[PDB]
Amino acid sequence: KIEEGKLVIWINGDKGYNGLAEVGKKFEKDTGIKVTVEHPDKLEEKFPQVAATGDGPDIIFWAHDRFGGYAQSGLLAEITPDKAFQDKLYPFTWDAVRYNGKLIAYPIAVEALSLIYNKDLLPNPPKTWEEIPALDKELKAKGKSALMFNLQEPYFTWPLIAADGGYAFKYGDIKDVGVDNAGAKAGLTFLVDLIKNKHMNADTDYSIAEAAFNKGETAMTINGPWAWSNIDTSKVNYGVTVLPTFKGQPSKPFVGVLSAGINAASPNKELAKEFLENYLLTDEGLEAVNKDKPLGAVALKSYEEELAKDPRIAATMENAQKGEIMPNIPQMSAFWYAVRTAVINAASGRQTVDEALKDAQTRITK
Helix, strand or coil: CCCCCCEEEECCCCCCHHHHHHHHHHHHHCCCCCEEEECCCCHHHHHHHHHCCCCCCCEEEEEHHHHHHHHHCCCECCCCCCHHHHCCECHHHHHHHEECCEECCEEEEEECCEEEEECCCCCCCCCECCCHHHHHHHHHCCCCEEECCCCCCHHHHHHHHHHCCCEEECCCCCCCEECCCHHHHHHHHHHHHHHHCCCCCCCCCHHHHHHHHHCCCEEEEEECHHHHHHHHHCCCCEEEECCCEECCEECCCEEEEEEEEEECCCCCHHHHHHHHHHHHCCHHHHHHHHHHCCCCEECEHHHHHHHCCCHHHHHHHHHHHCCEECCCCCCHHHHHHHHHHHHHHHHCCCCCHHHHHHHHHHHHHC
16 A cells, blocks of 8 residues: 555646655655655546555645545545644635544645736726726727626636625535525626626637737736736736625635645555644745745745735735635535536526526535
């Protein structure tokens, strides 16, 4: 099974594995235990297969929403950090790695959508969703649009739909879904109205929105940290800020948490703990990883306060703190497929907002 006396770690290829390897080397210096960092393809798919037979790595890094399923099959070991260590991280990041009342992973980085705008076209971004329609008619007079973002993916339109009370799964309860309530209804109705009023095209997708924003054709867009390097090149003077409110309520974008779990079949659980707590989860630890590839906003308060000197990161955290922690249950798959269809049918007039959400709700709680 899993080798004893060493630590093998799995992390995705789009992360700072080289930097993580650095922290691993430091661990090896003052312990004698070697740390091997690997980044296989479809690791989020392989882990379940190899762990089920008592194999795989000691530690696995992935978005939190996936750990719920791994825990369900008893693949993840329950972690037990003391109160002292727990206070080192933002409170809400812990609700991301909680399953059935147990901590199943260590929070690392936080990710959420923000509002991105062209400072030259819009020196003062809108703080409200209701003022956007008016803003657009003013920008149209100059041949510009006010807002453009991916309307095809629920992930991108959810922030609006949930602002006034909508939600996926109430902290765990798989039978408590909020996609067809008055809140979600209001938000989606506002979105459809923006489309039927020619303020937005129902076919606008990720690429169309990206190219348009980066070419200065639109004043605003909605995206995550993964899109900043692409905008830095376009030579557009942009800023990142908090998302607009709807009916006075903050937009609720889904929150993604990069987390580190420990294989239940690992004989090196104590070493993994020592590594994650006293080596990786430190200012020097996250710095080594960040230097290789930026993590965005981090769950470690001490280091986050330093990275927040970058307003883009500060905003990302602000939007995540007002966002909804993505449910870590497997039923989340029905949600994506259900809401996706509801938004498409509602936008195309094929179905009414009330009907679309009603059918979505039924499919999720089915």
